[PDB]
Amino acid sequence: VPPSTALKELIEELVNITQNQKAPLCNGSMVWSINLTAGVYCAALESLINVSGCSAIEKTQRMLNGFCPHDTKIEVAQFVKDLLVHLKKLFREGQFN
Amino acid sequence: SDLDKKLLEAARAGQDDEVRILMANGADVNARDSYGSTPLHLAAREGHLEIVEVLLKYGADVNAADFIGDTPLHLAAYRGHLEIVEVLLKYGADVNASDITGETPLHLAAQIGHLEIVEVLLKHGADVNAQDKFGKTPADIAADNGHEDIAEVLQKL
């Protein structure tokens, strides 16, 4: 899958979560916010790595694993929103095209 | 097809002369890349005013939406190009266009703290009461991003 396909599918899924899953996500799990010194896909994978068996984020984790083959603890719903906003900003900032 | 790819490239790069040549030679003004971006999206995003003007005069779709629902106006507002915001509105941009998460250009101008762009958008009928898919109005966004002066302007309307 091309970089454009990777981003489109990930963004669509994140939008789906924010609109269609009830907060709190993953039984009130908390995760570290994304490490901005790292690659975005790998950083996102790392943030979610310790959440197991949460069906809400399962597809996101699956996608992130494929895209990454090699400051505050926050709720998962917040993490999902922040990741989505961060990816939109990166796109508006010409980092993908 | 080759002309169209070159047009996307030249519009992004600010190559005024190349854009004029490609348009005169039949390039598709509304060419799309893999993300749904048009030459007008790229030129607006990158602050290329002359190119924005040329494209609009060639019939560019002022309200074309990319894969996240950005119109060129969203990108001009977010990237802080007042002059491009103004010309896009002049040529019929939808001041209240909503992206994939319901952000309007006013939301994005509030986010980056660009008061002049906020003011222009308001002058052209931007909806201060528009809520995005997170329940936030532009005034909420302005406060969240430490732009109290914008929040106050928006809250007085």
Instruction: Report all structural domains of chain A as residue ranges with CATH numbers, in order of start.
Output: 1-97 (1.20.1250.10)
What are the backbone dihedrals phi and psi of residue B149, each rounded to the nearest 5 degrees, phi first? Answer: -60, -40
Closest CA to B50 of B87, B5, B97, B102: B87
How far apart are the CA of A91 and the nearest CA of chain B, in angstroms?
9
SS (H, E, C) chain A: CCHHHHHHHHHHHHHHHHHHCCCCCHHHCEEECCCCCCCHHHHHHHHHCCCCCCHHHHHHHHHHHHHCCCCCEEEHHHHHHHHHHHHHHHHHCCCCC
Boundaries of every domain in chain B: 1-157
Contact A25, A75 (CB under 8 A): yes
Give me the long-range contacts of B128-134 (CB less than 8 A, separation at least 24): B128/B154, B128/B157, B130/B96, B130/B98, B130/B102, B130/B104, B130/B106, B131/B102, B132/B98, B132/B101, B132/B102, B132/B103, B132/B104, B132/B107, B133/A15, B133/A18, B133/A19, B133/B101, B133/B102, B134/A18, B134/A81, B134/B101, B134/B102
User: Which chain A residue's Cα is nearest to B46?
Assistant: A94
Distance from CA of B90 to the nearest CA of A (A): 22
Using CA atoms, how far residue B62 sits from A16, A44, B59, B74, in Å, is 28, 35, 8, 11
Angle at which helices B115-123 and B82-90 pack, to 10 degrees? 10
Distance CA B116, CA B104 (A): 16
Site of tokens 């994939």? B100
d(CA B82, CA B118): 9
Token couple for A54: 């949460």
Q: Are B54 and B17 in contact (CB under 8 A)?
A: no
- Which of B34, B79, B133 is nearest residue A19 as measured by Cβ atoms? B133
**Does B9 contact chain A (CB < 8 Å)?**
no
On whether the CB atoms of residues A73 and B24 are closer than 8 A, the answer is no
Contact call for residues B1 and B13 (beta carbons, < 8 A): no
- Distance from the B102 Cα atom to the nearest Cα atom in chain A, whole angstroms: 11
CA-CA distance, B47 to B111, in Å (whole number)?
18
Beta carbons within 8 Å of A10's beta carbon, 6+ residues apart: A60, A63, A64, A67, A87
Element (H, E) at B134: none
By the 8 A CB rule, do B137 and B110 touch? Answer: no
- Sequence-separated contacts (24+) of A69-73 with Cβ below 8 Å: A70/A42, A71/A33, A72/A32, A72/A33, A73/A30, A73/A31, A73/A32, A73/A33
* Distance, CA of B84 to CA of B75 (rounded, Å): 10
**Check whether domain B1-157 has CATH 1.20.210.10, yes or no:** no
Q: Using an 8 Å Cβ cutoff, are A40 and A87 in contact?
A: yes
Say yes or no for a CB contact (<8 Å) between A92 and B134: no
* Angle, in degrees to the nearest 10, between helices B148-155 and B115-123: 20
**Is the omega angle on the peptide bond into residue A24 within 30 degrees of 0, that is, cis?**
yes
Q: How was this structure determined?
A: X-ray
Residues of A in contact with B12 (CB under 8 A): 94, 97
Distances (CA, A) of A28 to A33, B4, B157: 15, 49, 38
